[PDB]
Symmetry: C2
Subunit: 253 residues, 2 copies
C-alpha cells in the first residue's frame, strides 16, 4: 500500500498574478481519487494558496524549515510556526540547499526529526550528483545520506523519501525509467534492513528528477516508484495535473 | 533624519501572537513623522500587511535571496517582495552572518540586488566579542562598510544599522557613549567615501538590546537616528514606547 505522492515544488518563483493564475489552473484540474498531491509555494504566498487552493484536491507544503525551534533566528521559519499556521508538509534536504547552503546529511536528518516531532510530514530528499554517479559512489552516497535519516527519524509514518539525482535535477536529462528504478529498488530493500520490510513496503519512495507531462508515463509504471517530486512542470497548471494522473493502479482510493 | 525605528520579530510567531501583536501595534500612537518598520517572518507578511495600520507602519522582510527568481528551493527573491507590497528588507543580520555564513561580500551583493529590485535595505553591521576583546572593532566596520560602498550605488533607500554581537540577546546594552562613539565613526567614514552630502542624510540606527528603558538615553545621542528592536518588538506597548523615543530627531 502506497497512496501515489505527486509533489509540486514551485521553488523560488511566482508573482501575484502568476500564483493566482496557477491557483486557478490547479483548481481547474481534476485529480484522480486517492492520490496525495502537495504543492509547495515560497513562504510569502502560503497564506493565499492555503486560502484559495481547493482543500479536497491538494494539501500545502513549505519549501524549507529551520533546524531549531523559535528564538532569535532572523529570516528562518520554524517548524512549529508552520503546524500552527496549518501547513501539513515541508521539503527538507533539497539538493539546492545541501549544496548552496552547505546542509549536510546530519543537519538534514536532524532538520527532519525536529519537524516530525513538531507535527509535520517531511518530503526528505536525497540524491547524488554527476561527480558521484560517474565515480560509482552512488552506493555510498545514498547509504550515507540515508543512515543519518535512520539515525534520527523514529516514526516513518509521515516521511516521503524523494530521490532527486542532481545530475538530473535542473539539467533536463531525466533519469531513464530503468535508471531511476534500479536506484529506487535499492532504497526499498535498504530500508528493509535498517527498519524492516513492513515499514519499507509502506513507505513512499517518490522520484524527483526532471519530470514532465511526457516522461511520467514510463516512470510511474516502474515498481518501486511511488510518486514524483515535480519542479519545473509544477509551475504550469495542466502540466502538473497530467503528472498527478499518471498514478494509475498505484492510487489507493 | 526621519527617526527610523525598526522591529525585527525574528523566528517568532503564532496565529494568536502575530494577530495579538498587530492589535497592540494598531492600538498605540506613533509620533507624527517617524519611519516605523516591522519585519514579521515570511508566512505572516500577508496578514500583517492586510491588518496593520497603513498610515502608521510599514512592512519589512527578514531576509532576501542573493539572486532573482529561479530554481532556489526555500528562498524568497527581492523581486517577489516588491510586487507583493513589501518596501523594506533586513539584510546581513548578525545571526545570518554567523549561523548561515553570509559572507561580507554576499551581504553587500544582497543589498545592491535588493535595491535595484525596488526595495529598501536595512543594512546590518557589527562586531563580535572576539572582535572587541582584540580591538579589531574599527577594522571590522571598515571592511564591512567598504564592501557595501562597493556594491551600493544609491544610498537613498539604505538604513545602516549597527549591531554589536556582544550586545544582542546577551542583554548587555552598548551604553549611550559606547554606541555614540561607533555611530560617529560610521558617519565620518560615510563622508569619507560618499561625501558629507550622503552621510548627513543617511539614517544610522542602533541595534542592540534596545528596550523602553534604555531607548530614551540612546535616542539623545548625536549620531543615533533610531533603533533596530529585536526582543522589545514583540510587545506592542513597549515597541510603541521606543517609537516615541524620537522626539525632536523626527518632527514632521
Amino acid at each position: 500500500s502506497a497512496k501515489f505522492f505527486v509533489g509540486g515544488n514551485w521553488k523560488s518563483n511566482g508573482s501575484v498574478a502568476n500564483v493566482a493564475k496557477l491557483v486557478d489552473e490547479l483548481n481547474a484540474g481534476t485529480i484522480p481519487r486517492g492520490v496525495d498531491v502537495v504543492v509547495a509555494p515560497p513562504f510569502i504566498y502560503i497564506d493565499y494558496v492555503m486560502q484559495h487552493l481547493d482543500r479536497d484536491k491538494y494539501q500545502l507544503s513549505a519549501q524549507n524549515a529551520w533546524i531549531g525551534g523559535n528564538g532569535a533566528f532572523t529570516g528562518e521559519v520554524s517548524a512549529e510556526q508552520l503546524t500552527d499556521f496549518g501547513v501539513p508538509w515541508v521539503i527538507l534536504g533539497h539538493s539546492e540547499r545541501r549544496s548552496l547552503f552547505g546542509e549536510s546529511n546530519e543537519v538534514v536528518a536532524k532538520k527532519t526529526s525536529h519537524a516530525l516531532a513538531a507535527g509535520l510530514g517531511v518530503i526528505a530528499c536525497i540524491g547524488e550528483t554527476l561527480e558521484q554517479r560517474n565515480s560509482g559512489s552512488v552506493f555510498k552516497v545514498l547509504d550515507a545520506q540515508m543512515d543519518a535519516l535512520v539515525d534520527e527519524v523514529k516514526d516513518w509514518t509521515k516521511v516521503v523519501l524523494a530521490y532527486e539525482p542532481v545530475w538530473a535535477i535542473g539539467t533536463g536529462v531525466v533519469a531513464s525509467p530503468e535508471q531511476a528504478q534500479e536506484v529506487h529498488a535499492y532504497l526499498r530493500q535498504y530500508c528493509a534492513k535498517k527498519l524492516g520490510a513492513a515499514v519499507a513496503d509502506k513507505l513512499r519512495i517518490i522520484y524527483g528528477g526532471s519530470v514532465s507531462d511526457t516522461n511520467c508515463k514510463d516512470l510511474s509504471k516502474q515498481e518501486d516508484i511511488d510518486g514524483f517530486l515535480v519542479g519545473g512542470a509544477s509551475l504550469k497548471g495542466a502540466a502538473f495535473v497530467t503528472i498527478c494522473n499518471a498514478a494509475g493502479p498505484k492510487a489507493k482510493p
